Ligand binder design. Structure first.
Ligand SMILES: NNC(=O)c1ccccc1Cl
Length: 330
């Protein structure tokens, strides 16, 4: 089997992407944030504290004839940005772009943190990291990909995120018309539960490539590109007036600037992030200070190849017995 679904930016900055997901019988369609950096499929629901719901579409398990309470199971997750959610668990039928999993754990939120409430466009998350990170207790549950894998034509999914435009998540096949040149594959460590890999280096604008190993995660659920302070300093040094602002919480730059591109290495291959992809707009409405899309990972504890990097590529998440990651230009 295969599936194919369009993923759409939630706003004009590409802060996140939502993908429609069918849950239950009859289908209830929710728009979920596909997150290769976590491993829980959770949704706003009829059980979510009413004051914490503000415009989201909810899943109502009592209206699904295929929903079954997973007795005794709870979940609770905290994300790197400080947000969180928790609740109980149903199993139900879940379909993405024509690909159906029966008995998928659907984690129903009883509580969500303010950042989730405040984002009316995201109805939940669909985790696509390794199932070892799943938070369901006392019996850990598998991700949608994990459950689907055996049935897929090939045990893979791909992320093709758009810049200020829709893109695609495919399951079970590689669309050879969706990228240019070849896909370069690189080793993955699953030891931390992530799609963790090592970039071979970077360049800033038309500058020379610096060969250096950068270990990080391919994370569709993180907006920006978080890299070591040395790398980030070298980038922003090429932008007149750019500076790190402790009060804003990262590098900012004059909105009048033209940003240089940023290149990252995948083996001997190179992915070029255009300068425009690194502009996250005014820090506050009407400001002439703009927020940068490349930020330091110092104090996160891990480098994160978030949407800013991933949307510059066609990305293969290869879930073969030894997982790998593939990157192509597009
Ligand atoms: N979607 N990404 C995550 O949940 C994550 C994983 C590891 C470190 C930091 C973060 Cl923000």
């Amino acid at each position: 089997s295969t599936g194919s679904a369009t993923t759409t930016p939630i706003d004009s900055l590409d802060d996140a992407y939502i993908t429609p997901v069918q849950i239950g019988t009859p289908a209830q369609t929710l728009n979920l944030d596909f997150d290769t950096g976590s491993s829980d499929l959770w949704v706003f629901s009829s059980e979510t504290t009413a004051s914490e719901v503000d415009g989201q579409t909810i899943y109502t398990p009592s209206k699904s004839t295929t929903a079954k309470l997973l007795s005794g199971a709870t979940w609770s997750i905290s994300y790197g940005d400080g947000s969180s959610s928790s609740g109980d668990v149903y199993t139900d039928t879940v379909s993405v772009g024509g690909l159906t999993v029966t008995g998928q754990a659907v984690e129903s939120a009883k509580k969500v943190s303010s950042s989730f409430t405040e984002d009316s466009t995201i109805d939940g998350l669909l985790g696509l990291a390794f199932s070892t990170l799943n938070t369901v207790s006392p019996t850990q549950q598998k991700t949608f990909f994990d459950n689907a894998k055996a049935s897929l034509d090939s045990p893979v999914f791909t992320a093709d995120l758009g810049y200020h435009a829709p893109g695609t998540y495919n399951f079970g096949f590689i669309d050879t018309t969706a990228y240019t040149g070849s896909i370069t594959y690189t080793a993955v460590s699953t030891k931390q539960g992530f799609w963790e890999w090592t970039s071979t280096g970077y360049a800033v604008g038309s500058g020379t490539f610096k060969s250096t190993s950068i270990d990080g995660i391919a994370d569709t659920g993180t907006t920006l590109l978080y890299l070591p302070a040395t790398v980030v300093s070298a980038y922003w040094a090429q932008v007149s007036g750019a500076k790190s602002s402790s009060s804003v919480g990262g590098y900012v730059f004059p909105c009048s600037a033209t940003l240089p591109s940023f290149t990252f290495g995948v083996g001997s291959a190179r992915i070029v992030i255009p300068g425009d992809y690194i502009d996250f707009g005014p820090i506050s409405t009407g400001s002439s200070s703009c927020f940068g899309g490349i930020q330091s990972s110092a104090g996160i504890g891990i480098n994160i190849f978030g949407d800013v990097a991933l949307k510059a590529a066609f990305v293969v998440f290869n879930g073969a017995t030894t997982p790998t990651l593939g990157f192509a230009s597009k």
